[PDB]
């Protein structure tokens, strides 16, 4: 304390899973040290896409569960939060870093840089060789005159460049490896380079947890934080902690297509947030060697992101849907329901029971799917306009004998009094293992065909309660023939 | 939730060698049939043979069933109002039932060797079919009196209807045997001494048995049995004919029988693992037969309010140690801390395996290790550490991780140690992060390893600083000074 962490996605595209793991991953940092979690839009850069995807990464925290201390509309005392609101702030922290020496105007083309390593004996494959270090004012003003517009480079530490990764351990780049590296673009604007350390530095961020691919930026960054406390604008470097790339089946990094790296994807099936939380917070972490099944809290208490691995994180469609499943039999039934009837409703499938029915129904179903989306299904037969009888249960539990079955049934359910559970079973039993001798299981088959459409649905008798009297009689007298 | 309404059904082993778990399956489910129904579960002994029978088999059968906390409402010590219940004591019984079946007809004495199907001779009907002589039905008295002069010893032979034989098989469904399709077979071998032909069907008829639940490599004595039943209520013996359930043989990886070879196969191979009841029961449950469509997981209680044979499914069932081993680790998990507590108290002691700690510890090393074993007998490798005597580096682990890089973290975590003020798990951790995270900059990971290792003698464990508290102080700083050097 007090650690302060920050979530900096570019609005660019739909968040994907691994981009929702890191964000995960520096909330539980933040709530378990008691620290802040910063939440930094970086904008820079527009494209097309950019407001619906800004949109879409807010809806995910806020779906998921994982407020912000500081950021967008909540504002906080190191604003602003959006980057594209921030250029006089870069423009200012550049004047300071030239003034200070710390970085200089370069003016080499490609070609230049190209011809100096031939002249060399060097191969030009080696980046920027750190020529403009040593121009004169009147070569800096003679590029001016021709129209030469420079970039901006800082100027590397010329000794070994190391830090000790909270991830990965110590990491070392050797004395002299790393080229001085462009701050701006040719037009002046700032850079990637600039803004995400100028803004981790103002911010007093003590924490950087991030996707390993951006691991090779961060000698570059460490040199640039160190020249931040030189010239006044920060007193402290943070620390640096690079996370496990989440991949796919195959290899590769997860892509950016295939669907099972789509946040909106599980959503929509109908995943829960307590279920993809759980799965999420697996990539690269476990809570302890005997289990993996977790609330957010247990989370929250126990991450430490030392305690993260460098070790693959793959993508296991199989175990998410495990944990998602486990995370919905856990909740109260009426949570459960609510949440529900709202996935059913919001995607067009409504149910045609009443609140009471409903609730029933729900209950039954709990136990019984792994995604909310599943229950539509199991469930639709409940619906009169989506009533059909499945050919192969109506071939199976509709024919000749099924006549038989769907006669003796007949017989035995019409004279109850009262459509309520517990009854019909006895009436059915009765009939069909009773007097006709067959397993119970044909018993109580024809009629779930007859009722249901489907040789699996529901447990039975509820399902035939919730149905109601004369919607049973109706289509099991239907059915026979 | 229906019934028979008297329910009674058997279960007959005959002692021999340890009970498989088949066979264990096949009580099981006669146990949880009865109970479902109100009905009555009567053990039988089949000990007519004295070669095979067993004394060390009686004791191992009566052991099995009483550990699954199965009982028995009529069978050895209670009793019961269809006596005796042993087969060997009933021999005057199955004579009289000869004696009554040979008067009526129903039995006759063969002289003939014992038709096999292996070679027959055309049955004469316009499509020509194989069949079965049954010769010595026909046999003269004057014929027997001559061949009974002549020293020839018979058999009694059932004599087999001439009607199709079948039955509504509670789990296979409907099973027919054309008429002819069965010999007359033997109730008797020549000495006079009875069959199992003759004493288990006489025995169920006599025992007043409603429901036959056995394994399907039974079910083809099924027609025979059938055929002496319905003659057993001819003579007066028998009222009714029971119904059948033949149980899915249990399947290897073959698609044989569950070896008897296979160690899989022996409930006390099971048991010695560290099983326990609960767990062991929720599986043989399963082998044939599931409680509901959601759930794999469930006790006895609910397993008998569940249960209706008739459920029972005639698929192939897989013996699945993994599956197994997993149920009874969820039962393990499922039990109160105190009553676990005792079980693996009691288990290591009886294996000679105490653990050497007192009841405060011992109840927080078992609380520990409630989670982390799939059966009791984990428990030994897990804890045996706190034993002195037990104590031993794993080289690969020494070699590992008690090399030079070792020293740096030895080092500070016996300074840091030295200067916990309380010896307790967070005082521990406490001290250990602020020497090894924070003061040597380690990942936690490669931070506490070599203190495993010194601590624990291997490179898994419990968890780590409790483990380290309930060792005590002096023995952490011992063992973590011992390796040090």
Not at 87 to 94: C, F, G, N, P, S
Not at 133 to 150: F, I, M, N, S, V
Not at 367 to 390: C, M, P, S
């Amino acid at each position: 304390e007090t650690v302060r962490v920050r979530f900096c996605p570019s609005p660019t595209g739909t968040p994907h899973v691994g981009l929702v793991r890191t964000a995960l991953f520096n909330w539980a940092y933040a709530r378990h040290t008691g620290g802040t979690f910063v939440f930094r839009i970086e904008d820079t850069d527009a494209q097309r896409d950019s407001e619906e995807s800004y949109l879409a990464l807010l809806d995910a925290l806020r779906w998921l569960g994982l407020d912000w201390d500081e950021g967008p509309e909540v504002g906080g005392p190191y604003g602003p939060y959006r980057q594209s609101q921030r250029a006089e702030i870069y423009r200012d922290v550049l004047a300071r870093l030239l003034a200070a020496g710390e970085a200089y105007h370069a003016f080499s083309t490609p070609e230049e840089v190209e011809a100096r390593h031939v002249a060399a004996g060097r191969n030009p494959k080696l980046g920027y060789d750190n020529f403009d270090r040593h121009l004169t004012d009147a070569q800096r003003a003679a590029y001016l005159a021709e129209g030469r517009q420079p970039v901006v480079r800082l100027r590397m530490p010329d000794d070994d460049l190391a830090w000790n990764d909270l991830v990965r351990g110590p990491v070392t780049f050797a004395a002299g490896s790393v080229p001085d590296f462009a701050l701006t673009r040719a037009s002046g604007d700032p850079l990637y380079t600039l803004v995400n350390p100028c803004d981790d530095a103002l911010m007093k961020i003590t924490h950087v947890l991030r996707g390993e691919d951006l691991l090779p930026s961060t000698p570059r960054q460490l040199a640039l934080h160190q020249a931040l406390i030189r010239i006044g604008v920060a007193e402290r470097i943070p620390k640096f902690a690079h996370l496990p790339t989440v991949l796919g089946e195959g290899t590769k990094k997860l892509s950016k297509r295939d669907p099972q790296s789509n946040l909106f994807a599980h959503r929509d099936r109908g995943f829960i947030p307590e279920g993809l939380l759980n799965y999420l917070a697996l990539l690269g972490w476990s809570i302890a060697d005997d289990h993996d099944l977790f609330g957010l809290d247990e989370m929250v208490a126990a991450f430490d992101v030392a305690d993260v691995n460098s070790s693959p994180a793959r993508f296991d469609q199989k175990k998410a849907d495990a944990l998602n499943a486990e995370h919905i039999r856990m909740l109260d039934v009426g949570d459960f329901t609510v949440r529900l009837r709202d996935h059913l409703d919001t995607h067009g499938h409504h149910i045609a029971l009443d609140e009471a029915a409903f609730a029933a129904a729900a209950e039954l179903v709990q136990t019984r799917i792994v995604v909310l989306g599943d229950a539509w299904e199991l469930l639709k037969f409940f619906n009169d306009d989506q009533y059909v009888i499945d050919p192969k249960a109506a071939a199976k539990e509709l024919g000749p004998d099924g006549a038989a079955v769907l006669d003796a049934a007949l017989a035995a359910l019409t004279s109850v009094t009262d459509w309520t559970a517990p009854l019909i079973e006895a009436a059915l039993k009765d009939a069909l293992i009773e007097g006709l001798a067959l397993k119970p299981r044909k018993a109580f088959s024809p009629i779930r065909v007859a009722a249901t459409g489907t040789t699996v649905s529901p447990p039975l008798f509820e399902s035939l309660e919730l149905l109601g009297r004369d919607r049973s009689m109706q289509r099991l007298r239907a059915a026979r023939q």
